[PDB]
Amino acid sequence: GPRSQKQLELKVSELVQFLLIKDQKKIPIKRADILKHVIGDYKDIFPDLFKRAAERLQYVFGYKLVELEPKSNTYILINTLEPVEMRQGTPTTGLLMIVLGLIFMKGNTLKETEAWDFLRRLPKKLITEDFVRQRYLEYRYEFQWGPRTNLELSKMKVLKFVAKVHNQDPKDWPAQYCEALADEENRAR
Amino acid sequence: GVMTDVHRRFLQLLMTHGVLEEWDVKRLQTHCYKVHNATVDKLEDFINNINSVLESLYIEIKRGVTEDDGRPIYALVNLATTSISKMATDFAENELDLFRKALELIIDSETGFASSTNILNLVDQLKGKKMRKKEAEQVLQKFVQNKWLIEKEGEFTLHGRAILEMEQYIRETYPDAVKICNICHSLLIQGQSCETCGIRMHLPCVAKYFQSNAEPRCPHCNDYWPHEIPKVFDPE
Ligand SMILES: [Mg+2]
Ligand SMILES: [Mg+2]
Ligand SMILES: [Zn+2]
Ligand SMILES: [Zn+2]
């Protein structure tokens, strides 16, 4: 029918939304699915329309819309940038992070064994004994953070970390969190 | 308008996140600059810029403020009215319909909160293929994880983000059940009402309207104001 400038701009917008939303799922997106769920009667002018989606998609959000296999009839989103709480990073550092993590979470102090059975699960004994030389303080086998770390990380960062594992961070944090912020403020002076 | 990689990367992030509080978006804005090292515009000026290359998409980085304590949030929101779809795309038919049903309850609810149990009863109603309460309890956590829903004490309210996204939709769809603040005049999900009127206003609105006033009086009807006046938001 009669489609104004905006009717169309709205359509491309709709499409770039569709794509954006899907790519999160790393689907990948089907041209027919694109056609059923967005184009409707605007099919006649689609290729030009797609072209626009593609460009806006690239230009405003910096995503390259790409068919993944030639003649796939299927598309995906590629990040043009750029690219990318503690960071090709070391293997052990993750481990540590987890551990210094555990420690923050159960009241800044935790017994040994309990973690250990639970840890192998996911060089244990020896690496964590030497973790002590630097990052750790252990008595008897109770655990605390140890001096080295606070110079290298924060209660907040450890939080961001434990956060990112499940994602989020309001819920496991709030209890802990409040000090973590009282630490962020503590860090200013 | 002049777009930079810093701007696109901001948008990429702002989206993977549903919504962000003011400081987190400046923490963000600055991040993108430091990751792209120049002078960093007043976050406010930065945004307006972007919002302006967005016009042709008829979508905007929108600033809003929470119904529980008036924190500033920002989401990427559609100016197009029929925003059933940002979620329509994200979830299953049955999941979407569960949201509807839940939203439907949040609105009628005097509180703007609905019990989990009241919601789950609606599970046999659900369109788009049978699910069970177990499955349903997860999905509700999904909506929470994605900032469409908020929970307090096994009850659920719309997330600020939800409102920013779908206010349009909602009002057009539930005109006789929606509530609007005086003052703001915007959609209002939870807030204080007057006992004499039936007037309602968002907490933060009640905070500001009666700010520094020793005798808060109901604006319409001027009766004495029955509820505790919140102290307006400030960075602390
Ligand atoms: Mg790993
Ligand atoms: Mg062994
Ligand atoms: Zn209001
Ligand atoms: Zn009144």
B53 → closest Cβ in A20, A60, A84: A60
Q: Find out whether A40 and A1 touch, Cβ atoms under 8 Å.
A: no
Alpha carbon A133 to its chain's center: 32
Q: What is the largest CA-CA distance in chain A?
A: 81
Q: Find out whether B97 and B143 touch, Cβ atoms under 8 Å.
A: no
Could you tell me the CA-to-CA distances from B130 to A124, B92, B115, B135 in Å, in that order?
47, 12, 21, 10
Please provide the size of chain A in residues. 189
Q: Which structure tokens are listed for A179?
A: 């000090």
Q: Which CATH number fits domain B1-80: 3.30.2230.10, 3.90.1150.220, 3.50.30.60, 1.10.150.120?
A: 3.90.1150.220
* Eight-class DSSP state of B57: G
C-alpha to C-alpha distance for A41 and B198, rounded to whole angstroms: 46
Query: Which residues are within 8 A (CB) of A183 and not within 5 positions of it... i.e. 6 or more apart?
Result: A154, A155, A156
Buried b (16+ CB within 10 A) or exposed e, A44-82: eebeebbebbbebbbebbbbebeeeeeeeebbbbeeebe
Q: Find out whether B43 and B25 touch, Cβ atoms under 8 Å.
A: yes
Please provide the size of chain B in residues. 236
Reported resolution, Å: 2.9
C-alpha to C-alpha distance for B23 and B33, rounded to whole angstroms: 15
Q: Find out whether B98 and B139 touch, Cβ atoms under 8 Å.
A: yes
Ligand with an atom nearest the CA of residue B206: 3
Q: Which structure tokens are listed for A47?
A: 């290729």
For the B81-178 domain, the top CATH level (class) is mainly alpha
Sequence spans of domains, chain B: 1-80, 81-178, 179-236
Residue closest to B225 by CA, chosen among B183, B176, B177: B183
C-alpha to C-alpha distance for B77 and B18, rounded to whole angstroms: 10
C-alpha to C-alpha distance for B69 and B86, rounded to whole angstroms: 26
Beta bridge partners of B201: B192
Interface check for A5 against chain B (CB to CB < 8 A): the answer is no
Q: Which structure tokens are listed for A133?
A: 């030389």
Cβ atoms within 10 Å of B150's Cβ, excluding its own: 23
How many angstroms is it from B202 CA to the middle of ligand 2? 59
- Residue found by looking up tokens 């244990």 in the block: A124
Buried b (16+ CB within 10 A) or exposed e, B118-149: ebbebbeebeeeebeeeebeebbeebbebbbb
Q: A74-79 and A63-67: which strand pairing? A: antiparallel
Beta bridge partners of A94: none
Q: Which structure tokens are listed for B10?
A: 């901001």
In terms of CA atoms, which chain B residue is nearest residue A170?
B145
Q: Which of B5, B9, B35, B78 to mutate to test the interface with A (most CBs of A within 10 A)?
A: B9
DSSP helix/strand/coil, B135? helix
In terms of CA atoms, which chain A residue is nearest residue B50?
A60
Cβ atoms within 10 Å of B162's Cβ, excluding its own: 26
- Residue found by looking up tokens 């002049």 in the block: B2
How many angstroms is it from B79 CA to the middle of ligand 3? 20
Q: How big is the CA angle at B162 (ends A163 and B153), to the nearest 5 degrees?
A: 60
Q: Where are the beta strands (DSSP E) in chain B?
A: 19-21, 59-65, 72-78, 114-115, 149-152, 155-158, 192-193, 200-201
C-alpha to C-alpha distance for B66 and B192, rounded to whole angstroms: 14
Sequence spans of domains, chain A: 1-85, 86-189
Task: Report CB contact under 8 Å: A82, B35.
Answer: yes
**What element of type H or E holds A104?**
helix A91-105
Interface check for A17 against chain B (CB to CB < 8 A): the answer is yes
- Residue found by looking up tokens 């400030």 in the block: B234
- Residue found by looking up tokens 């709205």 in the block: A10
Q: Find out whether A103 and A95 touch, Cβ atoms under 8 Å.
A: no
Cβ atoms within 10 Å of B220's Cβ, excluding its own: 12
Q: Which structure tokens are listed for B135?
A: 């499955």
